[PDB]
Amino acid sequence: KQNWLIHLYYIQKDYEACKAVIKEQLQETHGLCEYAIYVQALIFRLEGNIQESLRLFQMCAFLSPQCADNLKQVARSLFLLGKHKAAIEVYNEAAKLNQKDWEICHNLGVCYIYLKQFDKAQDQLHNALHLNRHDLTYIMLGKIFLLKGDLDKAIEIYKKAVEFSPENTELLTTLGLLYLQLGIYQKAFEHLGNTLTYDPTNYKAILAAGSMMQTHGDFDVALTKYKVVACAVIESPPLWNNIGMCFFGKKKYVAAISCLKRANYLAPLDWKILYNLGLVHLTMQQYASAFHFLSAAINFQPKMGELYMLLAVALTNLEDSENAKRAYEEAVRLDKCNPLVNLNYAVLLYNQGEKRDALAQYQEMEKKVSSSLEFDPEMVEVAQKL
Amino acid sequence: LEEYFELIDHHFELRINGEKLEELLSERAVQFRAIQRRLLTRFKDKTPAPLQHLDTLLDGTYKQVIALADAVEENQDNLFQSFTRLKSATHLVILLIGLWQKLSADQIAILEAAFLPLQQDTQELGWEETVDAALSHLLKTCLSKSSKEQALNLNSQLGIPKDTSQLKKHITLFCDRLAKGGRLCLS
Amino acid sequence: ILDENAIAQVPRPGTSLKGPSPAVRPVTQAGRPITGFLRPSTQSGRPGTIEQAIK
Amino acid sequence: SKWLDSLSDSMANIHTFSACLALADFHGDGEYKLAMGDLGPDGRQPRLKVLKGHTLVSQKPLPDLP
Amino acid sequence: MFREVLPKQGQLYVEDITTMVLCKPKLLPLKSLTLEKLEKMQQAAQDTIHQQ
Amino acid sequence: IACIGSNHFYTDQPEVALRFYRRLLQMGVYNCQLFNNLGLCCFYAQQYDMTLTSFERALSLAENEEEVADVWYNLGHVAVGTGDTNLAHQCFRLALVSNNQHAEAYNNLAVLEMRRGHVEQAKALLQTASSLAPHMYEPHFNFATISDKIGDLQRSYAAAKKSEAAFPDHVDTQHLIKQLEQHFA
Amino acid sequence: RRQTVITTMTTLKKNLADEDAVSCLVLGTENKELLVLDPEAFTILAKMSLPSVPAFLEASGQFDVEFRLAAACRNGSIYILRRDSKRPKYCIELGAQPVGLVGVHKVLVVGSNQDSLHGFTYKGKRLWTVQMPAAILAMNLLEQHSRGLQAVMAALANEEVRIYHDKVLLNVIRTPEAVTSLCFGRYGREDNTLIMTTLGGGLIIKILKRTAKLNVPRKTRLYVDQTLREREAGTAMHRTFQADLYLLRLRAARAYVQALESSLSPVSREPLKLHAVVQGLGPTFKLTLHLQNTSTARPILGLVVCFLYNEVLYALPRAFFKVPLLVPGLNYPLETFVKSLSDKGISDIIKVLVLREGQSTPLLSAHINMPMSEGL
């Protein structure tokens, strides 16, 4: 029962003299220490070996069969493996022995979330709140809400969360991103800027804020904010895609596709970078690469109408107009809230001399009205012509 | 289940002896290599230098290496004979379990595949690991119902064990849960 | 492994023999990414022990 | 550089913690000695070592680990 | 006539969700003349053995 | 020319590497390696009219089973770029058929499998890859990621550590290691 | 008998808060008690209960007026015990077990096992946090009365002592081997000695002197000339790429059907995978087959492995052998010993067919190019 030596060899990240003292103290007491096996298990856990911390903490539970901490540690070592059902059924008995510790509630909530049992997980995390609330409870609750239903409870629970302990970056950035995915924008910028105040150069908030600024023009400020972190993460497909779109905003097409190709070499299976490569090659009038990247992104994202519209815009300029027809047919069947597809199909039909279903496409478009500076003139010119 | 476990324990003792002898031989070979490299560096130098201490250390280390090699050969042969006797033991045990619970031909083939895995022990795969993994899987997906047991006791791993306690626990549990109406399947 | 002829044992980084990151340029070992030209003397690393070399 | 290294020894065995490492003139005459109650290499030989200047002078054996 | 109007906004990532990494395309190194000749000689030895 | 060409190809300049390898082709070099490199620099320089014929020439000239496997591997990369995961699947599987110890083909085939939904196939393929080439950070990182996705934080950590051993300045491996160490404590 | 243990000691002043006065002892036990004793340890003066076993102690203030007993426990928290406490009544969380603690005049410092320093106040409110670039081994209470600087000596695992104080950048010192214990005090005759004991034994003594933009690539003329040739003649490139891709799909389907036909794939219901490794450079090789059943949950009972080899060049003892019950998710390494029989250096291929017992078509195959003999 002199365990202070094992304790100080553990807490000092020694882990090689500590095991020797464990051997000596199991040679002095033959076990029955309840704090040498505990610390050997914690050694094996903080080293990453949990298949043995499991057995050691199970011995500890064998030594003190009425103690919440040993069952806690065995079920934690069960959860840190893949096994969640057993972890839950050990947390059950650990709760039977004591219903006053919050950690049992929180970890039960997590394990239930893994098995898609969101109802009982919600209840367990409710009790975890009502006992002694911690931020992780809020984060896991938000995960339940987002994977389960709508954001009209996630934003409220994350607001409740950030209310206290507001200097926490994870909660702030998650709430900002939830606002962004929601309708509101100004609040998203508010919370992400708060994150940037607390954490000056974090990747998540900087990326999201740059996306916001890009969507509202402001390509230079977004480019500087990317430069803030462009060395902390030198090879990340999202950063280079956003930088390529920053340059494409300010008519620097060559640097735009250089950034987009560097991003696409690092993520050949992402459809946003491919959509961007195809769009920019439509703008530079390549029509032999635009079609390539657009068809690739179509393969990776087949349920999108803008991709088929742009594949058709590329095919129309490739002396291949029947594939343009059928692509536009897929595009109009898939697209609901973007009249540019209908406008481009109407222009194709008109220039094909058809002019009869060109009015059908114009009618489909006007049923969807949204005004780009160039989306209006060609629209009204096709209009007066029909 | 009691004159059977004695052959399993004999086999595992031979395996553990072989692993100990292999570690001893590892150490002897490393020492021989160090001394031989010292002698080599001595041979490269142009100037004379007394070294009889070194070569009389080398001779001792080499005779110990020869001893340990012969001992590992002996243990390999003993282990092979123990494995061949254990094969017959487990043959008879499967026969008796099939007569004792009226096992069909397929339920006998599952036993013959789980309990009679391989032809001889190798330095990466042996008998106890394989039969214990197979029995754990069969108990886990055919007989057991509780999940805490399926995750804590019933675990399948393929490294040399520390003792035959789990293998014997699982063989007895397999016998008794066959006695309680359980039947064997695959998926 | 068994032939030692280098004088130093921990030479300054840059004075002994013992670019695109592995996220871009493939590698043959941990270091020394793939080259453009194979001569019959390229090393692209050194195996530590004898066990590390036979295996 | 802001410290003057008086002694940086490399191969003497001293395994003590900052709690069992105290300094005083346990004898008098206004000259400070350093007592260190250490367990030695491991929990075998705990011996109170007294240091005076640059070299050890005495190690009192202890019954258990300090 | 009418040219085809195109979208100008593009697609932007708002989060860096983790993905799975593919290995990268490999440029095969070019063998030297001496290496080629050594391989040629050993293959020729193997061949002139095989014919018996 | 080969060294500067490879360097140019890998530092975001496939057109200049194409110039260099085209120079090697003008001077009368005729290999499988040269033509594989040419097809790669063509596909990545966006010279789509000269890529696949160069790959077919490379396959013709290949005189081993490792060269054939590398050419099928690169053809699978061209397929992945083109946006067809079935042709990519077949090309990586043919890279394996031609050379069973091709860790990169295993890694990419496991990525495509995990994209289909076959998590167990992907896990076994990534384990085979990370056992064939331990110095490759990609199978380690992939296995750690799809282990952490399913729990199993022990193997997730054991794989992230070897990832970071292979390519230490990798950022995602650092984030994953920090997450797992937080979980451990 | 029931055997107790003392785990930490610390002293506290009596009346005037100077070094010329006497100092009352404080102790912590493994049995959950904290004992404040007379400065000479002949009478128990204050027993105190602790919610958990203590690990580190510190004390401030005067005995009669008020004493503050900061006990950093092992349960991942500290407890400040004050006068007349039937329960310590003051707990503070940190989130882990502390590696030490340091009491400056007003604020208290705690070093976290997660490699950080956290400055609290005695009230219970966290004030400031800072991260350390290495693992904190041990800390202590530096002092210099001729200056007034009273900072923390934090030993790190990167062979360094490092901290950021309020305004000045001090406690920055390197060391050959990681230091594990520190004691700043008056040693010999000088008032500013620093003794340290490192990891692998050793001993360090330091005297303190009284004089205290983006990398967006560059696109050359080749890029513009080729985007020009694509702008003029994009349709030819598009058509020829589509033709070559149709031919490529044809040839890949052809080779894939051939490999299915000859069972040459080592990965292709019946979910299996097999690769082979050759280890050894002599006339004998360990050929180890890694065989794995890759399925959710179902074993594979009836399997066998056959070796197709040149019976002149290679001698395999067991060519045909059965395969154990492949538990799903486990790798089975099956060894064999190949022996090169060719008196010269002659290599050859070795095929491995994994197939069911009943059927006769290989479930899968592997190929091994056996290396050169290098034998005799």
User: Where exactly are the structural domains of chain G?
Assistant: 4-212, 213-268, 269-376
Q: How far off is chain A from F28, nearest CA to CA, in Å?
A: 30
Residue type, E36: E
Burial class (CB in 10 A: 0-12, 13-18, 19+), A44: buried
CA distance A310 to A324: 10
Q: In what order do the strands lie in the sheet with G321-322?
A: G321-322, G304-308, G349-355, G364-369
Nearest to F81 by CA among A293, D1, A4: A293
Question: If 0-12 CB within 10 Å is exposed, 13-18 middle and 19+ buried, where does residue G230 land?
Answer: buried
Which is nearest to G122 in space by CA: G65, G61, G47?
A: G61
Which amino acid appears at position G76 of this protein? Answer: G
| Distance of alpha carbon A163 from alpha carbon A191, whole angstroms | 12
> Euclidean distance between the first and final Cα of chain A, in Å?
95
G230 and A286: CB-CB below 8 Å? yes
C-alpha A204/C-alpha F114 separation (Å) is 26
Amino acid code (one letter) for G94: L
Across-strand partners of A142?
none
Distance (Å) from the C-alpha of residue E6 to the closest C-alpha of chain A?
Answer: 8
Strands G66-73, G77-81: pairing kind: antiparallel
Could F138 and E29 be called an inter-chain contact, meaning their C-beta atoms sit closer than 8 Å? no
CA proximity to E32, closest of F21, C37, F58, F62: C37
C-alpha span between F80 and A269 (Å, rounded):
7
The pair of structure tokens assigned to G252 is 């890949």
**Which residues touch G36 (CB under 8 Å, ≥6 apart)?**
G12, G24, G25, G26, G27, G45, G46, G47, G48, G67, G69
Which residue shows structure tokens 């949990």? A50
- Listing from the earlier edge strand, what are the strands of the sheet with G33-37? G6-13, G23-29, G33-37, G44-49
Distances from the Cα of A118 to the Cαs of A316, B13, F9, F153, in angstroms?
50, 50, 50, 22
Cα-flanking dihedrals φ and ψ of residue G139, to 5°?
-135, 170
CA–CA dist A299, A308 (Å, integer): 11
Neighbours of A39 (CB within 10 A): 23
Q: Which secondary-structure segment (H or E) carries D6?
A: strand D3-9
- Chain D: closest CA distance from residue A17 (Å): 7
Q: How far apart are CA A340 and CA E7, in angstroms?
A: 8
Contacts of D33 (CB under 8 A, 6+ apart): D23, D24, D25, D26, D27, D50, D51, D52
What is the edge-to-edge ordering of all strands in the sheet holding D3-9? Answer: D3-9, G201-208, G190-198, G179-187
Structural contact between residues F144 and F156, judged by C-beta atoms closer than 8 angstroms: yes
Q: Residue F18, class by beta-carbon neighbours within 10 Å (0-12 exposed, 13-18 middle, 19+ buried)?
A: buried
- Is the Cβ pair A296, F83 closer than 8 Å? yes
Q: Which residue of E has its CA nearest to G348?
A: E46
Helix A50-63 crosses helix A68-79 at what angle (to 10 degrees)? 160
DSSP-derived pairing of the beta strands C37-38 and E30-31: parallel
Q: Which residues of A47-80 are buried (b: 16+ CB within 10 A; e: fewer)?
A: ebebeebbbbbbbbbebeeebbbbbbbbbbbbbb
The Cα-based distances of G8 to A22, A335, G52 in angstroms read 20, 73, 14
Bridge partners (DSSP) of residue B135 are none
d(CA A17, CA A22): 9
**What does the longest C-alpha to C-alpha distance in chain D come to?**
42
Closest by Cα among B158, G146, F174 to F182: F174
Q: Do D9 and G202 touch (CB under 8 A)?
A: yes
Crossing angle, helix F137-148 and helix F171-184, to 10 degrees?
40
Residue B74: which H helix or E strand, with range?
Answer: helix B52-100
Which of F15, F23, F113 to mutate to test binding with chain G, by most G CBs within 10 Å of its CB?
F15
Pick from G112, F157, D40: which is nearest to A20 by CA? D40
Q: How far apart are CA B148 and CA A54, in angstroms?
A: 13
Cα separation, G99 vs G135, in Å, equals 10
Residue with tokens 């509101």: A184
**What residue type is assigned to position G304 of the chain?**
V
3-state SS record for chain A: CCCHHHHHHHHCCCCCHHHHHHHHHHHHHCCCCCCHHHHHHHHHHHCCCHHHHHHHHHHHHHHCCCCHHHHHHHHHHHHCCCCCHHHHHHHHHHHHHCCCCHHHHHHHHHHHHHCCCHHHHHHHHHHHHHHCCCHHHHHHHHHHHHHHCCHHHHHHHHHHHHHCCCCCHHHHHHHHHHHHHCCCCHHHHHHHHHHHHHCCCCHHHHHHHHHHHHHCCCHHHHHHHHHHHCCCCCCCHHHHHHHHHHHHHCCCHHHHHHHHHHHHHCCCCCHHHHHHHHHHHHHCCCCCCHHHHHHHHHHHCCCCHHHHHHHHHHHHCCCCCHHHHHHHHHHHHHCCCCCHHHHHHHHHHHHCCCCCCHHHHHHHHHCCCCCCCCHHHHHHHHHHCC
Reading the block at residue A202, the tokens are: 């974090």
Lookup result for tokens 């794995």:
G292
Contact G69, G85 (CB under 8 A): no
Helix (H) or strand (E) holding D49: strand D47-52
Q: Which residues contact G108 (CB under 8 A, 6 or more apart)?
A: G58, G70, G101, G102, G119, G120, G121, G122
Distance CA G224, CA F19 (A): 14
Give residue G184's Cα distance to chain centre: 32
Q: Which of C23, C26, C38 sits opposite E30 (nearest CB)?
A: C38
Nearest to G338 by CA among G324, G352, G322: G352
Compute φ and ψ for G95, nearest 5 degrees.
110, -5
Rounded to an integer, what distance in angstroms lies between the CA atom of residue B7 and that of residue G183? 62
From the number of C-beta atoms within 10 Å of its C-beta (0-12, 13-18, 19+), residue E32 rates as middle
What's the Cα-to-Cα distance from D8 to each of A155, D4, D58, G138, G242, rounded to whole Å? 60, 10, 20, 19, 74
In A, residues 225-254, which contact C (CB 8 Å cutoff)?
234-235
Of residues B79, D8, A322, the one with CA closest to residue G198: D8
- Chain centre distance of CA G252: 45
Distance, CA of A266 to CA of A238 (rounded, Å): 10
Query: What SS3 state is found at D48?
Result: strand
Question: Rounded distance, CA A337 to CA A330, Å?
Answer: 15
**Burial readout B90-116 (b: 16 or more C-beta within 10 A, e: otherwise):** beebbeebbeeeebeeebbebbbbbbb
CA atoms within 13 A on the CB side of G154: 32
Query: G107: Cβ–Cβ under 8 A, 6 or more apart, which residues?
Result: G119, G120, G121, G127
∠ Cα D16 D20 D24 (to 5°): 115
**How many Cβ pairs closer than 8 A exist between chain E and G?**
6
Q: Which contiguous run of DSSP H or E holds residue B79?
A: helix B52-100
Evaluate whether F40 touches F9 at the Cβ level (below 8 Å). yes
Q: Which residue of A has its CA nearest to C24?
A: A266
Q: Angle A234-A236-A237 (CA atoms, 0-180°, nearest 5)?
A: 135
Sorted by sequence, the CB contacts under 8 Å of residue G220 that are 6+ apart come out as F13, F15, F16
Q: Reduced to 3 states, what is the DSSP secondary structure of residue E43?
A: helix
Helices assigned H by DSSP within chain F = 2-10, 14-26, 33-45, 52-61, 66-82, 85-98, 103-116, 119-132, 137-148, 153-166, 171-184
In C1-55, alpha helices (H): 51-54
| Phi and psi at residue B14, to the nearest 5° | -65, -40
Contact call for A214 and E12, based on CB within 8 A: yes
| CA gap G168, G159 in Å, rounded | 21
Chains E and D touch (3+ CB pairs under 8 A): no
Contact across the interface for G321 and B113, Cβ inside 8 Å: no
At B94, is the secondary structure helix, strand, or coil?
Answer: helix
Residue B113 contacts G, CB cutoff 8 Å: yes
Report the candidate in A100, A136, A106, A99 with the shortest Cα–Cα distance to residue A121: A106
SS3 per residue for chain G: CCCCCEEEEEEEECCCCCCCCCEEEEEEECCCEEEEECCCCCCEEEEEECCCCEEEEEEEEECCCEEEEEEEECCCEEEEECCCCCCCCCEEECCCCEEEEEECCCEEEEEECCCEEEEEECCCCEEEEEECCCCEEEEEECCCCCCCCCCEEEEECCCEECCCCCCCCCCCEECCCCEEEEEEEEEECEEEEEEEEECCEEEEEEEECCCCCCCCCCCCHHHHHHHHHHHHCHHHHHHHHHHHHHHHHHHHHHHHHHHHHHCCCCCCCCCEEEEEEEECCCCEEEEEEEEEECCCCCCCCCCEEEEECCCCCECCCCCCEECCCCCCCCEEEEEEEEEECCCCCCCCEEEEEEECCCCCCCCEEEEEECCCCCCC
Residue A110's CB is within 10 A of a number of other CB atoms, namely 22
Please tell me the distance from the alpha carbon of residue G10 to that of residue G103, in angstroms, as a whole number.
12
Query: b vs e for A238-255, b when ≥16 Cβ sit within 10 Å of the residue's Cβ?
Result: bbbbbbbbbbbbeebbbb
Q: How far apart are CA G341 and CA G335, in angstroms?
A: 19
d(CA G261, CA G270): 16
Q: What gap in Å lies between CA G289 and CA G335, rounded to an integer?
A: 6
Q: Centre a 10 Å sphere on the Cβ of residue B179 and count the other Cβ atoms it contains.
A: 11
Instruction: Give residue A122's identity as a one-letter amino acid code.
Output: Q
Strands G173-174 and G179-187: unpaired
What are the CA-CA distances from residue B176 to residues A193, B97, B171, B183, C29 (Å)? 66, 11, 9, 11, 53
Q: Is A137 exposed, middle or buried (0-12, 13-18, 19+ CB in 10 A)?
A: buried
Query: Could you say which of A233, A236, A299 has the minimum Cβ distance to residue F84?
Result: A299
Q: Are B150 and B138 in contact (CB under 8 A)?
A: no
CB of F185 within 8 Å of any CB in chain G?
Answer: yes
The answer to whether the CB of A205 falls within 8 A of the CB of A169 is yes
Q: Are E39 and A342 in contact (CB under 8 A)?
A: no
- Measured in degrees and rounded to the nearest 5, phi and psi for residue G108 equal -110, 150
**Mind spelling out the 3-state secondary structure of B104-164?**
CHHHHHHHHHHHCCCCCCCCCCCHHHHHHHHHHHHHHHHHCCCHHHHHHCCCCCCCCCCCC
Resolution in A: 3.1
Q: How far apart are the first and last CA of chain D?
A: 35
Residue numbers in A near B147 (CB within 8 A): 83, 85-86, 89
What technique determined this structure? cryo-EM
Contacts of F7 in chain C (CB under 8 A): 19-20, 36
Instruction: Kindly state the helix (H) or strand (E) to which residue B93 belongs, with its residue range.
Output: helix B52-100
| Ramachandran assignment for F115, one of left (phi > 0), alpha (psi -120 to 50 degrees), beta (any other) | alpha
Using DSSP's 3-state secondary structure scheme, residue D4 falls into: strand
Burial zone of B63 (CB within 10 Å; 0-12 exposed, 13-18 middle, 19+ buried): exposed
Comparing CA positions, the residue from A222, A201, A202, A224 lying closest to residue A212 is A222
Nearest to G182 among D18, D34, D38 (CB): D18
E27 touches chain A (CB under 8 A): no
Torsion of CA B83, B87, B92, B94, to 10 degrees: 120
CA distance F4 to F24: 12
Q: How far apart are CA G81 and CA G69, in angstroms?
A: 5
- A351: closest CA among A363, A366, A361? A361
State the burial class of residue E46 (Cβ atoms within 10 Å of its Cβ: 0-12, 13-18, 19+).
Answer: middle
Distance CA G265, CA G258 (A): 10
Q: State the Cα–Cα distance between residues G327 and A56, nearest whole angstrom.
A: 27
**What are the residue ranges spanned by the domains of chain B?**
1-187
The separation between CA B105 and the C-alpha centre of its own chain, rounded to angstroms, equals 29
